[PDB]
Write an enzyme that holds these catalytic residues in place. Sequence first.
Site, short mmCIF file in Angstrom:
data_model
loop_
_atom_site.label_atom_id
_atom_site.label_comp_id
_atom_site.label_asym_id
_atom_site.label_seq_id
_atom_site.Cartn_x
_atom_site.Cartn_y
_atom_site.Cartn_z
N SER A 1 1.40 6.36 9.91
CA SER A 1 2.77 6.12 9.49
C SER A 1 3.25 7.34 8.74
O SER A 1 2.52 7.86 7.89
CB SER A 1 2.88 4.88 8.62
N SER B 1 -5.97 3.33 10.52
CA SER B 1 -6.17 2.94 11.91
C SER B 1 -5.07 3.50 12.79
O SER B 1 -5.32 3.93 13.91
CB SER B 1 -6.25 1.42 12.01
N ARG C 1 9.75 4.91 5.98
CA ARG C 1 8.88 5.23 7.10
C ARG C 1 9.75 5.58 8.30
O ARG C 1 10.36 4.70 8.91
CB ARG C 1 7.98 4.06 7.44
N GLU D 1 0.82 -1.21 0.00
CA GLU D 1 0.00 0.00 0.00
C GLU D 1 0.85 1.26 0.00
O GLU D 1 0.63 2.17 -0.81
CB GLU D 1 -0.93 -0.01 1.20
#
Lengths: 312, 312
Positions: free
Chosen positions: A139, A136, A151, A88
């Site tokens: 990042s 949720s 990240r 993703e």
Amino acid sequence: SPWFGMDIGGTLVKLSYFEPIEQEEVESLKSIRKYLTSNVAYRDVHLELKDLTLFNLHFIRFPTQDLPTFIQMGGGAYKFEKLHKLDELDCLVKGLLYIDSVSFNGQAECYYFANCQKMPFNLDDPYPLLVVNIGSGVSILAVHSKDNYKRVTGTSLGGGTFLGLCSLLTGCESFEEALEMASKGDSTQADKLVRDIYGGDYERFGLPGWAVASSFGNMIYKEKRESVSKEDLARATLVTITNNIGSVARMCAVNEKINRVVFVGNFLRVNTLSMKLLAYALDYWSKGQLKALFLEHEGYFGAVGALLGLPN
Amino acid sequence: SPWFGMDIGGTLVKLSYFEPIEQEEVESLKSIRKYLTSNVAYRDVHLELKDLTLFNLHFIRFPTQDLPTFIQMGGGAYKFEKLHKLDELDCLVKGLLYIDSVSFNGQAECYYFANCQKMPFNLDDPYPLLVVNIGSGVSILAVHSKDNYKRVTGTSLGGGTFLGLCSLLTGCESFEEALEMASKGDSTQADKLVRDIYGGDYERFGLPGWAVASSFGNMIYKEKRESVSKEDLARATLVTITNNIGSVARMCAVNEKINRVVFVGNFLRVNTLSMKLLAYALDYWSKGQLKALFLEHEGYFGAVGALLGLPN
């Protein structure tokens, strides 16, 4: 040959499709997609992009359950096999750069809030760039070029943390319920402000009275516990989330020496309110040195990022 | 002439007294203080310091309501007038440096957890130093010398945020109730872990499965909402707080280039559990590059910091 790429979450599918400028085949395909959408009836067309060359782009969302019907016509895809997966975040990046490089039909894909009303932001040489993805959880990606990014940190207080709590605080069935609940609540009934301790500004350490001294600080007092409405805690819940995210983001921008912080994620789609509270928060922690930027196709970037891994 | 300085909060008074090595007057004073304390009966003596020259130190706490009785014998003091005020943080600093410079009766005032058991830490040349004060909220002080320090940031998620929530989540009457409740709860029933999304480690962005992906992420599912015990949310509530504080603290230590991060505040007094969860958290965000340090007289520093502004 009809090119497309899907973003498959656990409840929803986001998808982008390239309509080339045969004709009958696409039409009948379009007709029975019209069937299903008008079934669902019991802004996606606003974000259509036309007269763009790619070596139209349509944007649609529908329940994952509706997906298998199309055959006859990310996290979610592994459980739907019941294709080749793709990260993703990798798709988020590739997708994002593309649309921002191609503009939004001669209008700007990126914007911000001036102070508040919304105004555009030329983001055509976007490196480096701080991308804050709020699902949720959150990042944070530091993007240095189209082929390099990583990240650098995150926080566990994201969307799942807000709805998770409000559901426990409010019995709210859905997210938009909490949003519009929040939209009517006032957090100060729950949280303790600075002035709630010092009567005013804590001028010694450059603290205004209106800053939040303690999230839900006033909810240690049963008096105020009975006195708080559902919507406020809904509101109280979201404030903390946004303020914490702004703080982390600002500290990240400082350490990674990036001046451009754009917010994205499935969490930003349904309401601009979420967006504004981030804008106020990043403004406070960077003391205006940082503006928050947002994208009009926020939510389909993964979808389109999947569209451009297509093998030929 | 009996030298002392009080820390006056909204519920409690913390006080330090210098017993010089007349004798009858102190004794009778001590006798009727014994009266009142044995009234209350319906570790403070552990932290007594002896054979220290100051140009004994006793440490006591009692309800603010009990204070006026002594006449015949910070935030709270302004409302008790019903003296000269002094900034808690200034007193926190001055107090802290002093005791750490004077040791703890030939044992160490500062310690940490080795991994877990507690072990000491020579902190005699403490500059620079990162002090994380956790009260209702958290204020982070960067200390550069005895005469220079400033509040570089803070977070609104501190103690008042945890008890505030647990009270709303658990109906817990008091803090130690929530603590021991937390002490029995398991957060994973509430929060969504990494492995709850990917089945395992997110190795691509160096994420282990056991990290918390979303605080209360699993509480969006009514299934798991009925299935979570009071203690877990008590536990779930505290985890998030500690993890967020560790994250902010770590980001602060990085930007201010300080390697020593000590945690204090009225919030750390009743239980070592609060302390350990910070230690685990700072360990995770700094990836072991940072240890968390704590003080044995945590909570009376303000008190003693007030003792050394005495005019003569």
